[PDB]
Design an enzyme around this catalytic site. Structure first.
Site, PDB file in Angstrom:
ATOM      1  N   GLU A  54       0.826  -1.202   0.000  1.00  0.00           N
ATOM      2  CA  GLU A  54       0.000   0.000   0.000  1.00  0.00           C
ATOM      3  C   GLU A  54       0.862   1.255   0.000  1.00  0.00           C
ATOM      4  O   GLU A  54       0.691   2.139  -0.847  1.00  0.00           O
ATOM      5  CB  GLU A  54      -0.937  -0.007   1.198  1.00  0.00           C
ATOM      6  CG  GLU A  54      -2.074  -1.022   1.082  1.00  0.00           C
ATOM      7  CD  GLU A  54      -3.134  -0.609   0.075  1.00  0.00           C
ATOM      8  OE1 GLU A  54      -2.994   0.464  -0.539  1.00  0.00           O
ATOM      9  OE2 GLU A  54      -4.120  -1.353  -0.093  1.00  0.00           O
ATOM     10  N   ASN A  62      -7.770   9.163  -5.604  1.00  0.00           N
ATOM     11  CA  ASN A  62      -8.533   8.240  -6.437  1.00  0.00           C
ATOM     12  C   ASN A  62      -9.440   8.992  -7.407  1.00  0.00           C
ATOM     13  O   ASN A  62      -9.729  10.184  -7.243  1.00  0.00           O
ATOM     14  CB  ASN A  62      -9.360   7.288  -5.569  1.00  0.00           C
ATOM     15  CG  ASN A  62      -8.524   6.606  -4.513  1.00  0.00           C
ATOM     16  OD1 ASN A  62      -8.679   6.873  -3.333  1.00  0.00           O
ATOM     17  ND2 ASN A  62      -7.616   5.740  -4.935  1.00  0.00           N
ATOM     18  N   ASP A  82     -12.553   8.847  -7.823  1.00  0.00           N
ATOM     19  CA  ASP A  82     -13.804   9.333  -7.262  1.00  0.00           C
ATOM     20  C   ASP A  82     -13.624  10.575  -6.386  1.00  0.00           C
ATOM     21  O   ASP A  82     -14.577  10.982  -5.713  1.00  0.00           O
ATOM     22  CB  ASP A  82     -14.488   8.216  -6.465  1.00  0.00           C
ATOM     23  CG  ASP A  82     -13.836   7.975  -5.100  1.00  0.00           C
ATOM     24  OD1 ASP A  82     -12.639   8.270  -4.937  1.00  0.00           O
ATOM     25  OD2 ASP A  82     -14.524   7.498  -4.180  1.00  0.00           O
ATOM     26  N   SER A  88     -11.837  10.796  -3.646  1.00  0.00           N
ATOM     27  CA  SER A  88     -11.340  10.443  -2.324  1.00  0.00           C
ATOM     28  C   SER A  88      -9.817  10.276  -2.356  1.00  0.00           C
ATOM     29  O   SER A  88      -9.178  10.288  -3.411  1.00  0.00           O
ATOM     30  CB  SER A  88     -12.007   9.165  -1.817  1.00  0.00           C
ATOM     31  OG  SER A  88     -11.626   8.057  -2.622  1.00  0.00           O
ATOM     32  N   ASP A 147      -6.458   8.135  -0.294  1.00  0.00           N
ATOM     33  CA  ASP A 147      -5.922   7.137   0.633  1.00  0.00           C
ATOM     34  C   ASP A 147      -4.737   7.717   1.401  1.00  0.00           C
ATOM     35  O   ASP A 147      -3.867   8.363   0.818  1.00  0.00           O
ATOM     36  CB  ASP A 147      -5.458   5.884  -0.119  1.00  0.00           C
ATOM     37  CG  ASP A 147      -6.497   5.358  -1.100  1.00  0.00           C
ATOM     38  OD1 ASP A 147      -7.678   5.206  -0.716  1.00  0.00           O
ATOM     39  OD2 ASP A 147      -6.129   5.095  -2.265  1.00  0.00           O
ATOM     40  N   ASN A 150      -8.906   5.174   3.392  1.00  0.00           N
ATOM     41  CA  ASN A 150      -9.611   5.971   2.400  1.00  0.00           C
ATOM     42  C   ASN A 150     -10.600   6.935   3.047  1.00  0.00           C
ATOM     43  O   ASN A 150     -11.347   6.562   3.960  1.00  0.00           O
ATOM     44  CB  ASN A 150     -10.345   5.057   1.417  1.00  0.00           C
ATOM     45  CG  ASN A 150     -10.846   5.793   0.208  1.00  0.00           C
ATOM     46  OD1 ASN A 150     -11.925   6.373   0.230  1.00  0.00           O
ATOM     47  ND2 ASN A 150     -10.061   5.791  -0.852  1.00  0.00           N
ATOM     48  N   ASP A 154     -15.131  -5.125   9.092  1.00  0.00           N
ATOM     49  CA  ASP A 154     -16.329  -4.610   8.441  1.00  0.00           C
ATOM     50  C   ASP A 154     -17.086  -5.660   7.644  1.00  0.00           C
ATOM     51  O   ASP A 154     -18.144  -5.340   7.093  1.00  0.00           O
ATOM     52  CB  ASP A 154     -15.963  -3.438   7.521  1.00  0.00           C
ATOM     53  CG  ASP A 154     -17.156  -2.590   7.161  1.00  0.00           C
ATOM     54  OD1 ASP A 154     -17.888  -2.181   8.090  1.00  0.00           O
ATOM     55  OD2 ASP A 154     -17.351  -2.320   5.957  1.00  0.00           O
TER      56      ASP A 154
END
Ligand SMILES: CC(=O)N[C@@H]1[C@@H](O)[C@H](O)[C@@H](CO)O[C@@H]1O
Ligand SMILES: [Cl-]
Ligand SMILES: [Cl-]
Ligand SMILES: [Cl-]
Ligand SMILES: [Cl-]
Ligand code: NA
Length: 129
Positions: free
Chosen positions: A35, A46, A48, A50, A52, A59, A101
């Site tokens: 990562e 990203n 969209d 957003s 990280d 995120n 999650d």
């Protein structure tokens, strides 16, 4: 801060990540390797909108607030900038919420693509633990 492999493994263990949700320590080190390359200041934007953040690339769409991800959540209740600190406490605590999650570590696509099913124990081999 750019962590050493064994230094990060040791900090991850102390914050209780070893076998968290059944994921051995090598999984978390491998994930951090791919990562962020062990760099706590890593950021990735990203498509969209957003972003990280941090050694585990958490995120802003769901987990942290950076004030520039419209219609996003802050489930870890932190500023995303806390995820860039040389101390990984916030990142580890937030990773514990992500991995709980429902989808386990597949929440990190770098982990699914590059760590899952490999010899992840190699990432902590030769470390004093
Ligand atoms: C848990 C989490 O937020 N993972 C993110 C996810 O958005 C995706 O897998 C990728 C996108 O660049 O980077 C990070 O791993
Ligand atoms: Cl392991
Ligand atoms: Cl926002
Ligand atoms: Cl630390
Ligand atoms: Cl799981
Ligand atoms: Na957010």
């Amino acid at each position: 801060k750019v962590f050493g492999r064994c230094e990060l493994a040791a900090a991850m263990k102390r914050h209780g990540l070893d076998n968290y949700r059944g994921y051995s320590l090598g999984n978390w080190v491998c994930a951090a390797k791919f990562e962020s390359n062990f760099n706590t200041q890593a950021t990735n934007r990203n498509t969209d909108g957003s972003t990280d953040y941090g050694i585990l690339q958490i995120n802003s769409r769901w987990w942290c607030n950076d004030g520039r991800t419209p219609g996003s959540r802050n489930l870890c209740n932190i500023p995303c900038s806390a995820l860039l600190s040389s101390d990984i406490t916030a990142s580890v605590n937030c990773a514990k919420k992500i991995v709980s999650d429902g989808n386990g570590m597949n929440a990190w696509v770098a982990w699914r693509n590059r760590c899952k099913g490999t010899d992840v124990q190699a990432w902590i081999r030769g470390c004093r633990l």
